[PDB]
Structure 1
Amino acid sequence: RECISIHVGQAGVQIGNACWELYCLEHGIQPDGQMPSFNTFFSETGAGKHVPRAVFVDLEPTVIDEVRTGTYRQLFHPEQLITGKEDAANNYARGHYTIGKEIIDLVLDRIRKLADQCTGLQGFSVFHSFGGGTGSGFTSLLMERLSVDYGKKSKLEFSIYPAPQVSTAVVEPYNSILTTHTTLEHSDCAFMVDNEAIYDICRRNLDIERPTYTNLNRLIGQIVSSITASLRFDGALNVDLTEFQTNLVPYPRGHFPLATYAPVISAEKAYHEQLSVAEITNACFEPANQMVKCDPRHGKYMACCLLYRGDVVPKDVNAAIATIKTKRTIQFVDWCPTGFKVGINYEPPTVVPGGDLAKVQRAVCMLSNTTAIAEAWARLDHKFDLMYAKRAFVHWYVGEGMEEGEFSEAREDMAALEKDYEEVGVDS
């Protein structure tokens, strides 16, 4: 019943920092590993120290060093903290090939070591970003190997969705297009969120006009914990990760369920307001709490999964579902009946001490696969196209051995993906 977390790149690792901090908060784990009390994620020592079963990869020493100098440096095993010396430079060509390919063997052997520590490997999940060099480059490299060795294990990916308006990486389209090509075909499911959309959540629901990544990742951590801690904890409907895959992936392509999370409420907003299960789920179908800037009303739904924490009575859930099925404007694709996975944990929602979110007594996470995602690809299509037509920055990949045909090909694979969304949109 075990799983592995993999943190690649800054985004992967810094999100991971929040994630493991939250898992410590879930059980009262001390920075040194001492836990007085979740062995699905952790491995126990004779001292009662538990080791989070995870791998941290950075090709630049700095971020891992940040871990190594922080409080959780005692928690993590030195072998889990893997670092190279040089970067990918925002560039798949080095991340996947030239540079990252050198260290990956080590990385894999640490993974395999942990796989041998697992007794019942259920699977794993990889945290990264769609635009970066290691964030997406190295990441796909890893998938190429992990899908061989662990072909039957859960291969869930979580990635930051490139913001349409702000991006620090000029060749991000190129990176992301190459990842599509290689991740679609290897991964089982990839989830993503938009930091821009999140900012809007922070300013509207948390009332914060100063979000940093350390805020943004707390919110992400919430979502992740709902599906990682609480799915291993007790509930009414205990849903596994393999079950998630078995209930969220409808086609052999990928699919890309997007996150939505409600409650996201400031302490003051929690006052004077009573949420019910149904009210929280109402919020879950509002564009306003959509974690990716993509309009839910534009597309049609294919999948939807609702996962519940704390004070949730199935009775209320059932009523809530009835209304979301019938009251809303949620259009859905023919193919699908509304079999929405309901996970119901008794495990209460948790809050980070010193965080922004209010203590809540119940909480709902929503995953959804909508046809509007093709518009996200359309965004990438043109951004890629523009650059590629001019061949701007192309020498930074070509010099590492990339082929122009390959890039065209990858775009075409994306186009095919868009076409399949088109297909799904056609009802039948």
Structure 2
Amino acid sequence: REILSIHVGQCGNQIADSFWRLALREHGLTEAGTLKESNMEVFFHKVRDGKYVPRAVLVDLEPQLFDESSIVRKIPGAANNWARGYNVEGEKVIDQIMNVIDSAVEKTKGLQGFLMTHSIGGGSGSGLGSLILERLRQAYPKKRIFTFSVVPSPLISDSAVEPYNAILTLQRILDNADGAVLLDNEALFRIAKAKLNRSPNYMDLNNIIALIVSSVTASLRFPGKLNTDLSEFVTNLVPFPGNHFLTASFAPMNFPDLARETFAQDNFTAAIDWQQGVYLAASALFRGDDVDENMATIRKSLNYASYMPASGGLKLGYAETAPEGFASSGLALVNHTGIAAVFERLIAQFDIMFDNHAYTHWYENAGVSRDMMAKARNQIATLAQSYRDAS
């Protein structure tokens, strides 16, 4: 039940750092991976009696200690171009990235699958990120692949071409991942904004994320009973192969208060269309300080599509070890049809630019024609339409 984690790109490794940070403190390991005095060998790697190293590969990193034999320094070239990352520049390094990964699973008794932390708006995390997602499937067909993908939002964007990279990558996340957590900047923004009087900075957003990760990953690295393995994540949240795009929330930012906050619109990390959107599959996980009781109480709060059975469709878990800084916290993974919003948004943006030949050429001269791009959009459009009609 070992999970290899792959972080790619600036945003990819930025999350890596932050997450693996508390990743240790939670499991109580030192800056170097020792006991400063549970089944954790799922994320960390036991080297010797009391030594552990993070089961993770840092791909395309450009600035603490991970196995620098399993981390690849970035080679200039990706830019903000997806096509550039998935081809010209990715090619030069995909074979290597892959060996570095495979050599990390070699020292893996029973591999479960992978986790990928990256940004779908850049060029490294999107382009190269997609290429990896692809060759990762074509190599470990039986393994599960999960994603922590940051979606871009104009209210904190640095590239004009983002939505293009967004759509392109979303296609590969759709065709190769068993599930993806969409960390929406538009949401991460708003959250951080009203949480800290001044205009947010990538770090602030980066925080919310780090927590969301640890909390989502928790159940996989702790003794609990809910979402023991990525596989359970699937059977519990993906009501169908294609629709595997989830949202996650955090609480907080009492218990009735926690369970209330955990399932509070404003508390989620995604712009889901809470109005004409309906639930499909939920999952709460509280950790810290009588849970298998208020379950039915909550399900009456949430409104799933009609065809779903009244009671059930929602499972609640627990972990005694809460994230540092809290006595006990929440987290809610929800496969909600409102997630269609996020896609539709990206589409709309895409369309304007694309229909005017916005920056289309930088992509074509890089091995990504407008038709290929259009296909990418048309596909993601359907994916969203899909979620929409399911409501």
TM-score surpassing 0.5? yes
The answer as to whether partners of 1:309 and 1:363 remain within 8 angstroms in 2 is yes
Alignment check: 8 A CA contact 1:88 1:133 kept = yes
Q: Could you say which residue in structure 1 is the equivalent of 2:89?
A: 99
Report matched runs for 1:69-84 at 5 Å. 72=64, 75-84=65-74
Structure 2: how far apart are the matches of 1:164 and 1:240? 35
Quote the residue 2:14 is aligned against.
14
- Work out whether residues 62 and 74 of structure 2, in 8 Å CA contact, stay in contact via their aligned partners in 1: no
Q: 1:364 aligns with which of 308, 311, 330?
A: 330
State the shift of 1:35 in Å. 3.5
Asked if 1:145 corresponds to 2:135, the answer is yes
The Cα of 1:203 is off from its aligned counterpart by: 4.4
Distance 1:382 1:198, change over 3 A: closer
The number of residues matched between the two structures is: 387
Q: Supply the distance in 1 between the matched residues of 2:306 and 2:296 (Cα, whole angstroms).
A: 18
**Is structure 2 residue 326 aligned with structure 1 residue 374?**
no
The corresponding residue for 1:354 is none
The whole-number CA distance in structure 2 between the counterparts of 1:174 and 1:102 is 23
Give 1:182 shift: 2.4
Confirm or deny: 8 A CA contact 2:272 2:337 kept in the other structure. Answer: no
**Displacement of 1:221:** 1.9
Q: Deviations over 1:369-393 (max 9, x none)?
A: 2222222222122211111111021
State the match for 1:280 in structure 2: 258
The counterpart of 1:348, out of the listed 321, 331, 353, is 321
What are the Cα deviations for residues 381-412 of structure 1, in whole angstroms up to 9, with x where unaligned?
22111111110211111111221211221121
Taking structure 1 as the reference length, the TM-score comes to 0.85
| Cα drift, residue 217 of structure 1 | 2.5
Name the SS of the counterpart of 1:45 in structure 2: strand
Percent identity (aligned): 40
Match of 1:247, as an amino acid? N
Runs of 4+ off more than 4 Å: none
2:106 aligned with 1:116, yes or no? yes
Q: Residue 117 of structure 1 aligns to a residue in which SS? A: coil
In the other structure, the counterpart of 1:332 is 304
Confirm or deny: 8 A CA contact 2:347 2:377 kept in the other structure: yes
Return the match for 2:151 from 158, 161, 164. Answer: 161
1:389 alignment counterpart: 355
In terms of mean alpha carbon deviation, does 8-17 or 248-257 score higher?
248-257
Q: Distance in 1 between the 2:291 and 2:227 partners?
A: 13
Shift of 1:254: 3.2
Letter paired with 1:103: V
For residues 238-265 of structure 1, give each alpha carbon's deviation from its aligned partner in whole angstroms, at most 9, with x where no partner exists.
733221122111111032111111122x
Contact 1:238 1:344 in 2 (8 A): no
SS at match of 2:138: helix
Q: Secondary structure at the match of 1:257?
A: strand
- Secondary structure in structure 1 of the residue aligned to 2:269: coil
SS in 2 for 1:297: coil
Q: Which stretches in structure 2 are left out of the alignment for 5+ residues?
A: none
> What secondary structure is seen at the aligned counterpart in 1 of 2:208?
helix
Quote the Cα distance in structure 2 between the aligned partners of 1:372 and 1:360: 30
Counterpart code for 2:128: F
Task: Indicate the larger mover: 93-102 or 331-340.
Answer: 331-340
Instruction: Verify the 8 A CA contact 2:120 2:151 in the aligned structure 1.
Output: yes
Q: Deviations over 1:169-212 (max 9, x none)?
A: 211111112122222111111111223422433344x5453643
2:230 is matched with which residue?
A: 241
1:272 aligned residue:
none
TM-score, normalised with respect to structure 2: 0.92
Please give the alpha-carbon distance, in whole angstroms, between the structure 1 residues aligned to 2:231 and 2:117. 18
Amino acid in the other structure paired with 1:145: R
1:298-337 equivalent positions in 2, closer than 5 A: 298-311=276-289, 313-315=290-292, 318-319=293-294, 321-326=295-300, 328=301, 330-337=302-309
Listed as ranges, the gaps of 5+ residues in structure 1 are: 59-63, 67-71, 265-274, 352-358
Q: CA deviation at 1:215?
A: 3.3
**Change in 2 beyond 3 A, CA 1:237/1:257:** closer
Report the counterpart of residue 173 of structure 2 in structure 1. Answer: 183
Matched AA of 1:308: F
SS at match of 2:147: strand
What is the aligned counterpart of 1:87 among 77, 92, 98?
A: 77
Moved more, 15-24 or 213-222: 213-222
Asked if the contact 2:238/2:244 (under 8 Å) is kept, the reply is: yes
Which residue in 2 is equivalent to 1:355?
none
Taking only aligned residues, the RMSD between alpha carbons, in angstroms, comes to 2.0
Distance 1:247 1:198, change over 3 A: same
- SS of 1:128's equivalent in the other structure is strand
Give the AA of the match of 2:288: G
Q: Are positions 1:253 and 2:242 aligned together?
A: yes
Deviates more, 1:169-178 or 1:190-199: 190-199
Q: CA deviation at 1:297?
A: 3.0
Partners of 2:69 and 2:197 in 1: CA distance:
38
Amino acid at match of 1:239: T
Report the 3-state secondary structure (helix = DSSP H, G, I; strand = E; otherwise coil) of the residue aligned with 1:235. Answer: coil
Give the secondary structure class of the aligned counterpart of 1:99. Answer: helix
1:119 Cα deviation from its structure 2 partner? 0.7
Q: CA deviation at 1:81?
A: 2.1
Q: Distance in 2 between matches of 1:142 and 1:236?
A: 31
